[PDB]
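Components:
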Amino acid sequence: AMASYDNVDTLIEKGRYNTKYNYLKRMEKYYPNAMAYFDKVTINPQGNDFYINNPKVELDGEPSMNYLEDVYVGKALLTNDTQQEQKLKSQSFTCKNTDTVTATTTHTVGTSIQATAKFTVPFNETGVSLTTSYSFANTNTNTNSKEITHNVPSQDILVPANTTVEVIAYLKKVNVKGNVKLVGQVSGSEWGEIPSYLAFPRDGYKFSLSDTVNKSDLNEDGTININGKGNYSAVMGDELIVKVRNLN
Amino acid sequence: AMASYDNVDTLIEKGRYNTKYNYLKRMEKYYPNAMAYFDKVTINPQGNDFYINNPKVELDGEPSMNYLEDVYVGKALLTNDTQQEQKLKSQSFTCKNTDTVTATTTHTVGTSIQATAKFTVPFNETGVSLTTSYSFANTNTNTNSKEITHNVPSQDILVPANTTVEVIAYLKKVNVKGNVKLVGQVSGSEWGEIPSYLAFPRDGYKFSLSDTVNKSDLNEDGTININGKGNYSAVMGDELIVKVRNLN
Amino acid sequence: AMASYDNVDTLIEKGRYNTKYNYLKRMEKYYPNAMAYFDKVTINPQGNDFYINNPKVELDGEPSMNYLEDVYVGKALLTNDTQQEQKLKSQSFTCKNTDTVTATTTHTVGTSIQATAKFTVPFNETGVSLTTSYSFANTNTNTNSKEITHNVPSQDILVPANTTVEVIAYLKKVNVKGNVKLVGQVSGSEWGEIPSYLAFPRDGYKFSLSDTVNKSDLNEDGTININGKGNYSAVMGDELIVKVRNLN
Amino acid sequence: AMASYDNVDTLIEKGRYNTKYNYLKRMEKYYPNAMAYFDKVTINPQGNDFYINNPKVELDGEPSMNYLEDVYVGKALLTNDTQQEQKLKSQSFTCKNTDTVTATTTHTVGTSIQATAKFTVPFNETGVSLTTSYSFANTNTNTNSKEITHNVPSQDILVPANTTVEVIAYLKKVNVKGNVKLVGQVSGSEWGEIPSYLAFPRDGYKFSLSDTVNKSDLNEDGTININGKGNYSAVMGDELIVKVRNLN
Amino acid sequence: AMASYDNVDTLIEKGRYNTKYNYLKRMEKYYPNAMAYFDKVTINPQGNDFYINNPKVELDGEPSMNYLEDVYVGKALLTNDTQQEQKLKSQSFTCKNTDTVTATTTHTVGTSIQATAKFTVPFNETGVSLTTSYSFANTNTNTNSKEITHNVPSQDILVPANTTVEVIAYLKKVNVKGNVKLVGQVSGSEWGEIPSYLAFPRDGYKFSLSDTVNKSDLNEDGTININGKGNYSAVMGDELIVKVRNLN
Amino acid sequence: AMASYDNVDTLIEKGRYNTKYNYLKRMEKYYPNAMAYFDKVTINPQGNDFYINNPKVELDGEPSMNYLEDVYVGKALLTNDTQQEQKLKSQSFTCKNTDTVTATTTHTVGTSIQATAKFTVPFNETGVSLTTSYSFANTNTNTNSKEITHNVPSQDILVPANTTVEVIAYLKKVNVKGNVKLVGQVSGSEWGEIPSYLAFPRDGYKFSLSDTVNKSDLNEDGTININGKGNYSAVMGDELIVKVRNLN
Amino acid sequence: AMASYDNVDTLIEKGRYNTKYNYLKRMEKYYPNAMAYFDKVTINPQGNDFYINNPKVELDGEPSMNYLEDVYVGKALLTNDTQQEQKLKSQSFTCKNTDTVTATTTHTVGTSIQATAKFTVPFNETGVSLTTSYSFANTNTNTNSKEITHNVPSQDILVPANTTVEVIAYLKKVNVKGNVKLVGQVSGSEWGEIPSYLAFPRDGYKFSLSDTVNKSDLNEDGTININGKGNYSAVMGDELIVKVRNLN
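Structure:
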């Protein structure tokens, strides 16, 4: 109604810590030997489907960078001698990286029929065999590739009449951490599974974002209000540094 | 004529619930043992062909987002030192994902002819055979790939004379739910099949959107008026967040 | 001269119904047992080559849509903080679907020559054979792929100085029915075949669009005037719904 | 000098009818039994190389269309709510069709050396053979693909402040006939062959476009003036019908 | 110094006719039987490396066309109904043609070890062999493809408020002859070979463009001045004919 | 708080020299024979994850170039004769270089059943065998390609009414060294390993950028301030030199 | 300090001639028989890494062209009949040339187990064998392709109201020689090897650009000043000749 929350994670982790509490409670039937064993249980997620009705995401704070490696540094010297202000372009550059994975299976069913026959009349054991084969292969491939391109564009620079500019692009591969603030109305469940510890069973939990928050803390349509900021740590990225400069 | 409906789904589901009623009625000949068994029958669709004459679709309400994972965060620092307002471009990024499926079948028909012959004269059993093969393989492949690209464009930013801008693109993969309102005139049939329950037969129903609505609730041309809103839950998507900012 | 027609189909179907009349007439020689059998004959087309001289096609009426499935919904939040009206771009998206078909045939012709020889002197039957193979494979592949792309573009939006826009693209796959009106002068023949009914022969008809219309209903150059509207039912398609909106 | 011709075809066909006259004349040596046999001779072309010096081609008359099939119909609804005249883009579409042809040939030359040896000491006939193979395959592939794309572009539409446009692209595959008028100076030969009729020989004719026209009907440089119109029947094609329309 | 030449070909052919003179002179040692045999010698080029210092190429004269075949004719009808002057685009078209050539070679080295052994105790000759293979294939492929694209662009046409335009693109494949005039300073050698006539030897000539022209006809830096026009016969090409036309 | 550092490298190398000190200290238990052996130990990195919160990177100093080889030099002569200022384009050029790496593994499991039988009745030993095979291959490929493109763009040049321009692009492949200055707040650890010297063990170190700097030299959030310049030696690159020039 | 050099080549060749002097000096120990043998030694480079700090490259002098062959000549006739100044586009053209190189190696390890058994009871020697195979192939491919594209763009031409333009693009493949002037500060070494002459050893030289120039001819940071011009002979290239012309 009027109360809101500051993350979807403060709800998801609270629900998972409720699931790890319920599942460990469910062990007071036959295996209460590991009861207070509230660790190394590894509740993993499998089916997140929360929806943020009416979302208003927008990023705040500069992204925190983790620099991996340089990719390209391209200079370009664009001279104009045409008694008129031209618009010259520097060079481009793309860097693909494909990773294919394939798994095919063949089933062959052959069949042969030999009809050997030895005469032994002309000279010793001069036989003549005549076989006939037939086979049938039936393969079933299904590959999967994931391509990723980092294109450095080609800047068009208004170079004046008789002068040069000097562009320097410097691409670099990073992965960022950052923060992002959003508001909205979350609602929905999460089905996963509790992997069987080597003395425990495997159970398929499923909780919702309505039984993990105080009742009457949700709107009339089951949605609970969030107004906070979510993190997006460890996201692959880029960083271009262009420096166009007129030298004359 | 003057009466309209608020979905095509309120017609499709009503027709399917009519088909599940008729098909269960058809069991009072030989197998009325499971008669009130109005469940687990799984009437599946196979041949939807309704046409919305004169459609006026338009989306209302902000799409409800379900955030899957981050794809890319790309910063770009575009400096201008050219005593003139330039227009500099940040870097691009594409992310493909192909999934190929293949099924080939080979038919081979070989044939060999051996002509062995043992002399036994020079020394023990020194024979010399001479075979001759011939085969014929005839394969028939037919693959199928489905590629999907999420391209983050390269913004061109009017950076003033001696200053820098600082673009931050942040792509994210989501799948949305939303609502969409449309008006028009639906008309057409739906042919599917009723899968045979383990004590039931399989029958190929086919109903239309004219016998699932009150007669004289359709126009002169068989079409029934709809004026409402249709849902589009669970649609793969994206979400870009660009923040160009002049720092100086 | 002065009389015109309202379709090319009212001519094509009339010619085919003339061909099905002539071919059934041709059965009063040996097989008049199925004479009034004016059905299940399946006159199929094979060689349409009518030309519409001076065509003036133009579509009338909104296309009737048949909605198949959603493909993509992409939001984009483009913020400007640069004290200047920038032009920011949302993200793109492409969706390919390739279907390859292949048929190769290999012809192999091998040849071997074995020269076994058993010494039997050192110990029991210690022979040493030396064969020599030679083969020749000659394959002939000819594949065929058909790719189809549904590209959602990247809108560039004039976002004012310090504010954001909020683009929502929503692609959807449909196949449309519609109507299309054209005028012109049709002329030309249609060669097909009449498939042999299980008590009938196969005959290769060929009629023209000049002997299927009243004589003197054609111009001096054999062409007959059409002025009407042709249908284009069941054509694969798309439907994009863009909604750019300034939120502040 | 001052006389010109109205086609290059009225020259090519006249030269071929001269070649078919000369070649049939050449049969009064040994086989004059089929002499007036001025048909079913099938003079085919092999080496056209006429050049049209100073050409002035330009198309006249609307192309005569032969409609094959519809390819795509794409609607797009572009709404603007930004208090400013934006320029929004509809969706694109491409349709490839590749046809590959391949022909590879492998030559294998193997060689084996077996060294079997039966002990017969431990128990019955317990021999141990040890072979050694070596082969050499040398293949030579040379494929050939021909791709063809029909791209429907993405129109950018100036949609006013608070309103929508409604684009409808309708691609269609046709092949056209048309006419085209050109002037210039043709000159050059045509080498082909006269296929051997089943009672006739095969001869490799070669005529020029200077001995097929009245002498002094050519300029000083051997070229003969043409001023007419050439046909281009049966050319694969497209037909797009865009209808942008502002609805409000 | 002050004398110039009118081709590089009048130098290259003169040098080759000097080489064919020298090489035939070199036959007065052992084989002067074919001495005046100044024909069928086929001096072929292998190593042209002349450089045109300070070139000023520019084409004169319209290219002489040799028409091969039509490729595409695409009509497009772009209607505007938006109470504003829009800019609509017609459809595109590309036509690829790839020709791949491949040559791989495999070297296999196998090895087997069989260990057959016949018991003959349980019943007649019930032996059990156990072989073990090992091979090593080492292939080396190196292909080569040459793709060629003929792209017909998509014209954007300023269609006025309520009216239509009607674009007609007509691509055609030709190969042109033309002339081209250039000035500059040529200098450099040409190494080829004189193929051995069936009574002659093979010799590897090498002449320069300084010993094929009168001395003091070259500048101080060995370069000889050319000022003339060079031909470019038989060059694959295109010919587009666009005709945008406003019909209303 | 108030003290900052001038590199992230002066921290990383100091931490690694601390790790090489600790690990060599850890050898005074069993192997102090190589104790002062402070070399040839090769502490390699494996898990860098420092984040630069609030980074302000910007390049200073011109990049130091190391010229590898020329790639392309493309002239273009764009003449205008249209009594109007046109905008003509020069030619483009791209240079890809792909390097694929593949590793597949097949597992085959065959099975045959022969049923030979010798009659010996008609003549000597005329037997007839009939075998039947069945196999199952299951391969698992996973390739990896890395493409790199160096695109030289196509400059559009405003050539005046009756005159020519003369563009000269000159791409060249280099790899640069340069310097880059950044400020920010670094924080995070580095997990690697100390490879086992041939008399030493292997240990997996892990240090952070907070225990390698004087305490109270870090902010309240564990981050240590950096304000200096980092090097980016040996980065593949390009260098374009465009020279548009109006000649008349 | 104040003295500079006019090439990097006058330094590299001087250093190599110093290396060839030192290495030949090193032969007065055991093999002084070939001492003055100052030729056919072929000092080849392997590890150039000189860096030109603060480079100011810029091309002088028109490139000297060596014409290889014509690639394409494309005419285009763009007519405007729209009572308005349109902007029409000519056709494009691309010419790829890929060269792939591949090297894969397979390692197979098979294993079979036969279990033959001859009954001899029903009739003569009617045995039944049953084998069982198993193999394991492990291949490792790594290809490498190098694509090169020569794209002729599609000029957009402002054709006036009722008139035509006539574009002629003429691409041509050349390789240029040219000169290029640069200034900067070179510094760095060159590691190569001296290949072993058939009576000599192989030695891996390594010299720097600081011990090949007079000391105190270098700046304080080891760099030696260059101010001259470097050549770039034999660089693959293009040459486009566009001639737009308004004919009316």
